[PDB]
Amino acid sequence: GLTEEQRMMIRELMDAQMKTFDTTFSHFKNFRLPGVSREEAAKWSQVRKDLCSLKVSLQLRGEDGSVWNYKPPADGKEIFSLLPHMADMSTYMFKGIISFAKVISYFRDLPIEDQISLLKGAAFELCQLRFNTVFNAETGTWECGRLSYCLEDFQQLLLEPMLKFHYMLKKLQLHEEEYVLMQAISLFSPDRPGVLQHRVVDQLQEQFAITLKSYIECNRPQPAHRFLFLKIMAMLTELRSINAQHTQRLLRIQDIHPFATPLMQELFGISLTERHKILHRLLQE
Amino acid sequence: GLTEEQRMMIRELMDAQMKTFDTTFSHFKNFRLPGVLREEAAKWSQVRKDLCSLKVSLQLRGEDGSVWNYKPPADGKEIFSLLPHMADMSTYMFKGIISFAKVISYFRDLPIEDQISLLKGAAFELCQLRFNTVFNAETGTWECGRLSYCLEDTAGGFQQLLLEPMLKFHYMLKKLQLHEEEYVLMQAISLFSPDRPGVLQHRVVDQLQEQFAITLKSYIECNRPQPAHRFLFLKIMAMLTELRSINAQHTQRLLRIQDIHPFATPLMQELFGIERHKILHRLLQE
Ligand SMILES: CCC[C@H](CC)Oc1ccc(C(=O)OC)cc1NC(=O)c1nnn(-c2cc(OC)ccc2OC)c1C
Ligand SMILES: CCC[C@H](CC)Oc1ccc(C(=O)OC)cc1NC(=O)c1nnn(-c2cc(OC)ccc2OC)c1C
């Protein structure tokens, strides 16, 4: 079995996930909706390539049973139509991740600078891990309560590394304990930009990784997924590569079409404490 | 061929239609839309049967090419979700019909009370005739510019739609493949109905209706192949007779819905009887 500290470690992470992951997205309100220069022109071409890779239709299910469905247009600024909404979704998700990190005892004891640096480097990764738990691989749809995001028209989709990540991770059929441990391992990455206490974060990540390794051996005897632990660690390595690629994508689009919310601006590159006033405020409550 | 008086009649009606029928619905703006979220029971039960008869989805195409689609909920008060939009659409269509009648010389010379009585009796029918020209029978969709109203997919399929006499009328009328001139002549024959409630100059209106009918009869004889269009005029007049029965049915349906859930605009209230025609008098005086 697991040690007393290992079981309590999983118990704390699971309680954190329940307190801070709004799976029904019931409290995601007041969001935006679509339809509701030579140096600049050159940067547009690359931004158009970034936006056509992830094209989803939007579905809004009302309490009465009615459904409002948004089908995106074909490629001007029309390819930016979903950005103000996705910014509000990302910002809403990031607030839940910030709250997730705050209740973890190992994260709360860290200096405020390292708390800022770890959340900055892992925000995208923990959000994709949370999005994968509501991803329907049969329909290609992220089901976020009354909101749904359906991929628009497979081997072309799998070429997109972010979409391939969600299909591959969903195929592993992970439990909630394995997702929340993946979030812990990703959150406590010691080699994030700006981390000071490099060794103590490295030591915390090793305890979360050993706990995941021990959990799988004690709760997963089915050969359904052999080497599940090493497969998970490979997905986290791939998730770090996708994080760098898509963080560059957002900066390119933000350069010619500003959409990032004030919380996202601190999350990207738009003295550590002074440059992250909102993150510092949220991390105090 | 047609006589000069009959050609001038068709020419006046086509100009009336061109000036007053916004076929692209470009000037239908600021309309409302469904949100993003013992004896009283007998009124409700009949109204639930009344509102389940016509089930459409709403489609709004944006200028950039995007498409917002609204699928109505399944049968509370949610079965009313489309009423404010339909009240806006109907009010807009009725104004175009009033303007249509207002430029017809034979209509303006009638007494003002007969003008109001003819409009109240024919508003639904001229609205349905205009809607039929933008009805796509292959997709079951009224294409109104950037707005589209599509019959919802049902387990009964196409035969299910034919249960509603209103829908059967649109498919049957579209099957005739009528010209623009025949549509505008149908509207004139419907508008000048001498047996509407409250009509005083019964003989004058009846004589005006027969001239429009004779003109339509002569148009079909002179501009359509003799063999297969031998009874098109009689088929059209039978469609107008059936459209009048559907008018009586759906007017009663609207009054029942209004009795338990008010939705009619001020102009619609004057149209269904819900000084009595203050807005109608102003519109006819402009
Ligand atoms: C709700 C389900 C969304 C789906 C799930 C994978 O995926 C999309 C589908 C479609 C689109 C799209 O059609 O848009 C126009 C965009 C995204 N996805 C992000 O918009 C996005 N997901 N994560 N992040 C992000 C978050 C960060 O902090 C938390 C930091 C950086 C980030 O990105 C570099 C973003 C902007
Ligand atoms: C959008 C147009 C296409 C289709 C053709 C039948 O229309 C509907 C589609 C769906 C519905 C519906 O799903 O309902 C909840 C209702 C209507 N249609 C009227 O709502 C309506 N059409 N004509 N009139 C009306 C107008 C009058 O003066 C102009 C006078 C009386 C009238 O009716 C008694 C109404 C209220």
Swiss-Prot record, chain B:
It is found in: Nucleus. Its main location: nucleus. GO terms for molecular function: DNA-binding transcription activator activity, RNA polymerase II-specific; DNA-binding transcription factor activity, RNA polymerase II-specific; nuclear receptor activity; nuclear receptor binding; RNA polymerase II cis-regulatory region sequence-specific DNA binding; RNA polymerase II transcription regulatory region sequence-specific DNA binding; sequence-specific double-stranded DNA binding; zinc ion binding. Hyperforin binds at S90, Q128, L129, R130, F131, H250. GO terms for cellular component: chromatin; intermediate filament cytoskeleton; nuclear body; nucleoplasm; nucleus; transcription regulator complex. It comes from Homo sapiens (Human). Keywords: Activator, DNA-binding, Metal-binding, Nucleus, Receptor, Transcription, Transcription regulation, Zinc, Zinc-finger. This is Nuclear receptor subfamily 1 group I member 2. The chain holds residues 142 to 431 of 434 of the full protein. One of its GO terms (biological process) is negative regulation of transcription by RNA polymerase II. Heterodimer with RXR. Interacts with NCOA1. Interacts (via domain NR LBD) with CRY1 and CRY2 in a ligand-dependent manner. The gene is NR1I2. Residues 5-274 form the NR LBD domain. Expressed in liver, colon and small intestine. Belongs to the nuclear hormone receptor family. NR1 subfamily.
